[PDB]
Structures are given as C-alpha cells and as structure tokens.
Amino acid sequence: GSAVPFHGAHQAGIATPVQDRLHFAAFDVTTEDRAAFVALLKEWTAAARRLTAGHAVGEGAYGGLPEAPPDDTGEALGLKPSRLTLTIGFGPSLFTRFGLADLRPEALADLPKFPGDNLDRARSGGDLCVQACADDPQVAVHAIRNLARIGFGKVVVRWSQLGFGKTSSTTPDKQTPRNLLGFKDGTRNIAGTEKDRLDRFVWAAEKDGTPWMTGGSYLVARRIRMHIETWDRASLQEQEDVFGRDKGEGAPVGKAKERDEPFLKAMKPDAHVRLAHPDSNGGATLLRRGFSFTDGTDGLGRLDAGLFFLAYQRDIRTGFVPVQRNLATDALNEYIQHVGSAVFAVPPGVRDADDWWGSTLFG
Amino acid sequence: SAVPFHGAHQAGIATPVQDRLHFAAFDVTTEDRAAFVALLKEWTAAARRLTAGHAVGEGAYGGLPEAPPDDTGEALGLKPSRLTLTIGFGPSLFTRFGLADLRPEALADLPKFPGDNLDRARSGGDLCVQACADDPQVAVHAIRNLARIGFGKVVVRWSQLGFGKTSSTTPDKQTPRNLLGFKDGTRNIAGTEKDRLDRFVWAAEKDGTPWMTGGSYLVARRIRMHIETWDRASLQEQEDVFGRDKGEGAPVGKAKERDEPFLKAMKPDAHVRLAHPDSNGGATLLRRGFSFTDGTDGLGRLDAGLFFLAYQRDIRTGFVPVQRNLATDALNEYIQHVGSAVFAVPPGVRDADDWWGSTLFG
Numbered sequence: 031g032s033a034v035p036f037h038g039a040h041q042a043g044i045a046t047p048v049q050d051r052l053h054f055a056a057f058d059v060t061t062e063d064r065a066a067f068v069a070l071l072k073e074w075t076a077a078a079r080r081l082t083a084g085h086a087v088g089e090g091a092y093g094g095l096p097e098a099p100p101d102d103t104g105e106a107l108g109l110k111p112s113r114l115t116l117t118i119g120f121g122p123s124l125f126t127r128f129g130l131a132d133l134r135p136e137a138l139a140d141l142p143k144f145p146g147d148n149l150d151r152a153r154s155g156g157d158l159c160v161q162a163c164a165d166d167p168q169v170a171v172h173a174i175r176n177l178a179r180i181g182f183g184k185v186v187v188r189w190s191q192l193g194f195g196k197t198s199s200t201t202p203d204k205q206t207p208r209n210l211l212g213f214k215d216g217t218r219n220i221a222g223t224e225k226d227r228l229d230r231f232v233w234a235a236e237k238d239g240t241p242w243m244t245g246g247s248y249l250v251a252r253r254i255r256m257h258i259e260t261w262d263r264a265s266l267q268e269q270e271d272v273f274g275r276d277k278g279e280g281a282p283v284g285k286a287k288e289r290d291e292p293f294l295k296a297m298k299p300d301a302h303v304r305l306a307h308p309d310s311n312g313g314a315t316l317l318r319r320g321f322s323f324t325d326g327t328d329g330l331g332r333l334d335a336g337l338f339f340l341a342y343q344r345d346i347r348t349g350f351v352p353v354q355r356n357l358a359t360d361a362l363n364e365y366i367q368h369v370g371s372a373v374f375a376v377p378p379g380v381r382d383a384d385d386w387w388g389s390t391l392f393g
Numbered sequence: 394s395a396v397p398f399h400g401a402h403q404a405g406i407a408t409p410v411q412d413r414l415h416f417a418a419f420d421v422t423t424e425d426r427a428a429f430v431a432l433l434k435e436w437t438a439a440a441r442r443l444t445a446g447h448a449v450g451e452g453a454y455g456g457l458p459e460a461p462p463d464d465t466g467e468a469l470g471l472k473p474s475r476l477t478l479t480i481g482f483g484p485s486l487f488t489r490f491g492l493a494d495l496r497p498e499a500l501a502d503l504p505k506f507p508g509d510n511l512d513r514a515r516s517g518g519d520l521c522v523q524a525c526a527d528d529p530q531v532a533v534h535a536i537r538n539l540a541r542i543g544f545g546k547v548v549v550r551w552s553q554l555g556f557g558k559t560s561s562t563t564p565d566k567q568t569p570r571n572l573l574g575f576k577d578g579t580r581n582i583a584g585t586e587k588d589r590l591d592r593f594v595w596a597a598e599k600d601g602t603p604w605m606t607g608g609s610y611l612v613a614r615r616i617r618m619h620i621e622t623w624d625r626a627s628l629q630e631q632e633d634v635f636g637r638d639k640g641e642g643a644p645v646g647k648a649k650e651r652d653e654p655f656l657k658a659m660k661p662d663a664h665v666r667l668a669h670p671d672s673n674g675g676a677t678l679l680r681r682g683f684s685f686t687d688g689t690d691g692l693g694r695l696d697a698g699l700f701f702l703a704y705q706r707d708i709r710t711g712f713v714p715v716q717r718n719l720a721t722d723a724l725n726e727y728i729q730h731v732g733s734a735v736f737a738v739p740p741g742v743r744d745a746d747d748w749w750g751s752t753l754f755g
C-alpha cells in the first residue's frame with residue numbers, strides 16, 4: 031500500500047524493491063519549442079509528485095466545473111500509492127533537439143547490432159521513456175495515461191510495454207521471482223542496500239565525463255520473445271544445462287542452495303550464467319529490473335510470451351554491451367529472440383519540491 | 394487462500410471475484426471422442442492440482458533428467474491465490490463427437506449488433522477456460538500448462554489478460570472502477586444471492602437441457618474504450634453518459650452510490666437507464682468482467698477497455714435483450730466491441746472421480 035519517496039539524490043524505481051507490475055512507455059517529442067518542453071517536464075514532475083503519493087493530478091478527478099474535462103481521469107480514485115515509482119529517461123534521439131547535441135552522454139552508447147535480432151523499429155527507440163512500476167496495475171496505467179494526456183501536443187507515445195509480473199530482484203532477503211521458463215531470475219543481481227556496488231556499477235559519477243548525469247544511470251530495454259513451444263519440449267537436464275543452475279532450487283550446478291556462490295567451471299561452456307557472470311565480462315555487473323509479458327497468441331494456436339529485460343548501469347559500454355556480446359554463444363539463444371530495443375539516460379533524482387525532471391540537463 | 398474446486402457448480406461463477414484474469418479460448422483438433430474425454434479427465438486432474446497451488450503431473454523438477462518436466466515451473470513458490478478454473482463449451486464444439494443435438498437452445502449465437510467491429514480471430518472458440526486468481530502469474534501458469542497438456546488435441550485460439558482491484562490494498566467491499574473512471578459493479582447479481590442465482594444464472598433441468606442443470610451460459614465481449622476521446626469529454630458529459638455521478642457513483646438525484654436509481658431523471662440513452670432490468674423486461678445479468686490494458690496501438694492510443702463477461706440462465710433472456718437495448722446508448726460513442734464469444738459452462742466437478750464435461754459426454 032505504502033508510498034515510495036519520490037524525491038532523492040537518485041530517481042526511485044532503480045534501487046527500489048521491485049514492484050509487481052510494469053507499465054513502460056516510450057515517447058517521441060513533437061514540439062520544437064525548448065521552453066514548452068521545459069514547461070512539460072515541470073508539469074510532469076508535479077503530476078508525478080501527486081501520483082506517487084496516491085493523489086489525483088491537478089485539481090482532481092471531479093468537483094470542477096461541469097463543462098470542463100476533469101484534470102485527473104479518475105480510475106485511481108480510492109486506491110493507494112501501491113509503491114508507485116515513475117522513472118524518466120532520455121533517449122539518444124532527444125539530443126538532436128533543443129540544442130542538446132553536445133550534452134549527449136558518451137556513456138549513452140548506441141547498441142551494436144547483435145546476431146539473431148529481429149528488432150521491430152516501431153517498438154524500439156524513443157526520445158524519452160517513463161517507467162511506471164507499482165503493485166497495482168490500475169495505478170500504473172493511470173499514471174502513464176495521465177502523463178500522456180498532460181503531454182498531448184508536445185509528446186506522443188511511440189510504444190509501450192506492460193509487464194504482468196516481475197522477473198527481477200533488488201531484495202535478496204525476499205523470494206526470487208521466476209520467469210516464464212520456470213527459473214528464478216534475479217538471484218545474483220544488485221541489492222538496494224548494496225551502496226558500494228550501486229556506486230561502482232549503477233550510478234554515474236561526475237568524473238565519468240558528463241556532469242549533468244551525476245547520480246543518474248543508463249538503461250537498456252530489450253523485448254525478448256521466448257520460444258515456449260520448443261523450450262517446453264526440452265528435458266529437465268537440457269533446461270538446467272542452458273542456465274547452469276538447477277530448476278527447482280535455483281542453485282548453481284553442484285550446489286544445494288540458491289544463493290551458494292557458483293563455481294563457473296562446472297557449468298557448460300555455453301551456459302547463460304557462466305557467460306553472463308561479471309568474471310566473464312571484466313567485472314561488468316548489471317542491475318536487472320525486468321518483467322514478464324504475454325501478448326496474446328501467435329495467431330496459429332500457441333500462446334505468445336516473453337520477457338521485457340531492463341538493465342541499469344553506470345555505462346552502457348561497460349555494462350550491457352560486453353555482457354550481451356559474450357552471450358553470442360549462449361545456449362539460451364536457441365529459445366529466445368530479441369525483438370525490440372531502446373537505450374535511455376536516466377537523470378539524477380528530483381531533489382525536493384522545487385526541483386524538476388531534467389533540471390540538470392536543461393538548467 | 395484457496396477456493397474449493399469441487400461442487401454442484403463450477404467455481405469462478407458465484408465465487409468471490411478475484412483480482413486477475415487469464416481467459417483462453419481453445420479450438421479442438423482431435424476428432425476422437427474417447428481421446429477428448431481423456432483430455433477432459435487429464436485437465437480435471439491438473440485443475441485439482443493447480444487450484445491447490447500444486448504442480449501438475451509429477452511436478453516441475455525432481456523427475457528423470459532426460460524427461461521434460463510435467464509442470465513448466467513458473468508457479469513454484471507461489472500460493473493457490475484463490476485460483477479458479479472454469480471450463481465452457483462453445484457452439485462449435487457440438488459439431489464434433491456426435492454432440493449436435495446436445496447443443497443447448499439457451500446457448501444462442503449472438504446477433505450482429507449495431508457498431509460491432511469483431512475481430513473473428515479473437516472471437517468464438519470451441520472451448521474456454523476462465524482462469525481467475527489474485528496473482529496473475531498463477532493464472533498464466535494455469536492456462537500455459539493446460540494448453541501444454543492439451544497440445545495435440547487442442548490449440549489456443551485467443552488469450553486475454555485482465556485485472557480488477559488489488560485486494561492487498563483495496564477493500565473487498567469497495568466497488569471497482571473501470572478505466573473510464575466510474576464505479577462499475579454497483580447493481581449486479583452477487584454470488585451471495587443464492588435465490589437470485591437460481592432465477593437468473595443457473596440452468597434448471599426444466600429449462601430443456603438436463604446436462605446443463607447447475608451450469609450457466611457465458612457471454613464474453615472484448616470492449617475497447619476510446620480513452621483519449623473520453624478524457625476530452627466534460628465531467629457533465631461523462632456523468633450524463635451513465636446516469637450516475639463520477640465521484641460517488643450515485644444515481645442522478647441521489648446522495649449515495651447504492652441508492653436505487655430513479656431512471657426517469659437520467660437522460661433517455663444513459664447507459665444505466667437502458668441497461669436496468671426494468672428497461673429490459675426484467676432481464677438481469679451476473680457481470681464478472683475485468684479491465685484490460687494491452688498496450689499502445691499503431692496510432693499511439695491506449696489499447697484498453699473492459700473484457701466483459703456475463704453469466705445467465707439463458708443467453709436469449711439475459712445478455713441479448715440488454716445489449717439490443719444498448720443500440721442508442723450514449724456510451725457507444727466511447728466504446729467498440731471488438732471480440733465476442735459464447736459458451737455453455739457445465740455443472741460442477743462433484744468429487745475426486747468426476748471430470749469436466751461428464752454430464753455432456755456420459
């Protein structure tokens with residue numbers, strides 16, 4: 031039920047405990063007026079401060095002039111904050127606008143092409159994103175819908191993704207959730223309490239070269255289809271060999287308990303965990319924060335499902351990219367396909383009631 | 394925690410409404426009646442496991458290394474979560490297995506209605522399974538595993554996820570709001586109302602289809618909302634569309650949500666006025682639908698709405714007259730019916746030896 035604080039050095043929704051639901055929206059900018067865009071960021075911030083406290087935006091959902099559309103669309107009336115977080119990010123394409131070219135962060139690297147991808151361009155990229163996470167899906171949709179409405183005429187929704195259930199953990203003291211392949215996903219991640227690891231691996235620092243991004247992070251989103259029919263035909267041992275962990279307990283091969291440290295050399299050479307581990311990737315460590323999805327059927331008799339992968343890191347070049355490169359030979363590749371992608375620079379936090387999303391970028 | 398699976402009636406009709414839905418329509422590929430009965434028995438056994446929070450078959454792990462696990466594993470560590478699994482039989486089922494004359498007359502095909510825009514690929518179906526639970530992953534796991542168990546005998550035609558309230562934080566007695574921001578459910582048949590269920594929801598033997606006694610008939614409509622145009626309407630326009638105020642949800646002229654409506658005070662094509670039993674020869678529904686939000690369409694607009702479900706004793710005396718009377722509804726400007734199906738939902742699984750469809754198949 032409770033609220034997650036909206037203000038801080040960092041935006042919430044990163045280190046925060048992972049909530050049950052996701053509504054992620056990517057927007058494109060339509061206005062060429064920088065002052066109008068700044069005004070939108072401030073109005074959006076004000077809205078987010080209301081939303082994340084369980085309050086209606088603007089002057090509320092009713093009680094205004096009868097002839098006026100309500101300021102808030104009303105479907106969150108009577109609900110709780112439900113741990114809603116709203117996290118904004120700026121895509122590389124934003125920096126072509128508003129005289130921002132020289133402020134594009136070097137750590138906001140475009141991804142290379144990866145073997146096997148079939149990326150839907152229409153559901154990739156975006157000038158900006160808002161990640162809405164909450165325990166109540168109606169709270170999350172209300173937030174996105176009202177931000178979109180506020181932004182009408184200045185931004186448009188390019189694409190969106192709903193996540194029905196989490197597949198990630200920033201809280202190793204709680205149960206690790208399972209993805210739709212049936213495996214625990216999030217055992218060896220980064221905890222919200224691991225201050226030093228967050229500083230090392232997640233938060234941008236001023237000396238990294240982009241002052242406005244200090245206390246921000248960089249986000250990679252990958253929409254990944256799962257080949258459920260093929261997976262579900264695989265043997266237990268094939269599935270366990272793919273990952274390098276057993277399925278029921280989720281321990282590394284040869285170990286009895288989920289959180290026992292892996293002995294990588296006992297895994298298959300191609301195993302996902304072996305290839306993805308920091309030790310395989312120059313120490314590169316990610317904060318994974320994704321969710322599962324299911325998008326109807328394939329039209330031909332089969333349920334369609336997948337995982338909407340999210341990773342936060344201090345630098346895309348030393349986080350996602352080396353890891354995904356090392357997954358070129360991953361045994362998992364037989365059962366997945368990346369079908370959408372985007373990257374964003376997620377600014378530092380909203381410091382207090384007078385601050386606003388993007389203030390360090392825009393001034 | 395759990396809702397009992399066995400009973401005179403299938404659970405998921407009159408039982409308390411859960412927070413989440415995974416609804417699947419299936420088409421039958423087998424022509425062999427004995428093989429189909431064998432599937433119904435296997436599905437029943439699976440449903441007994443699933444609704445008690447247990448893995449299907451021999452489980453999700455621990456079996457022979459070389460064998461695919463019987464259960465795909467994504468519900469391990471979760472709870473029963475009030476899961477119910479409710480099966481229904483579409484009109485098209487009855488053209489198989491020599492069942493033709495056992496198609497109930499109360500399982501009427503819907504007429505075409507003004508403004509319909511039905512996607513035929515997301516309509517119909519030989520069978521349905523309505524999975525409802527508080528944890529969406531529990532519902533998805535159930536549908537995924539039933540589909541897996543049935544593969545070779547059935548395929549999935551279409552699939553819809555939905556949500557209502559989140560009961561951890563929202564009082565059970567509080568009426569849900571739909572995505573237009575209005576309370577939705579105020580005047581409905583509740584599963585507590587045993588006498589009203591016998592009048593309006595359960596099929597009786599005397600109604601003409603003995604195998605259906607204690608079953609019900611289900612209408613599903615996938616109803617998209619034009620969210621952005623709705624949100625541009627004034628508060629008074631919105632309230633006029635329904636005949637209730639938005640904040641409290643009281644009828645025009647009344648102070649409280651649950652005060653009985655005075656229909657004459659509503660506009661003549663207000664939704665409540667057109668939908669009320671008094672306007673429809675006494676026709677009364679058990680509405681049991683769920684909101685949906687599926688994404689953004691190819692114009693940037695929200696793909697969202699109501700996955701409307703109604704249970705009734707006879708489609709001809711329930712949904713059809715009411716929907717016909719919505720032809721001039723002021724709501725029509727803001728909605729579009731884009732998927733549809735009907736199903737005969739049999740009586741319950743009476744005990745541990747019984748199986749879904751036993752009254753139909755014998």
Ligand code: HEM
Nearest residue numbers: 209213214215216217218254303306307308337353354366
């Ligand atoms: C549908 C796709 C994916 C599935 C099903 C999946 C599944 C898993 C599972 C079951 C684990 C073991 C438990 C744990 O989190 O420690 C794991 C670990 C991991 N995954 Fe994935 N994963 C997927 C995609 C990716 C991608 C795209 C990346 C990065 C490019 C990635 C990076 C990692 C990392 C870094 C670990 C932890 C390794 C360690 O330090 O022990 N995963 N994944």
Ligand code: HEM
Nearest residue numbers: 571575576577578579580616665668669670699715716728
């Ligand atoms: C997206 C579409 C729809 C929306 C947003 C909607 C919304 C509402 C709302 C807000 C109410 C008032 C509160 C309540 O008593 O539940 C209501 C009542 C009702 N609706 Fe709808 N409805 C929709 C579609 C339908 C359809 C398709 C039918 C049947 C064909 C239907 C039948 C009813 C009935 C019977 C009532 C109760 C009237 C009474 O007895 O007072 N609705 N609906």
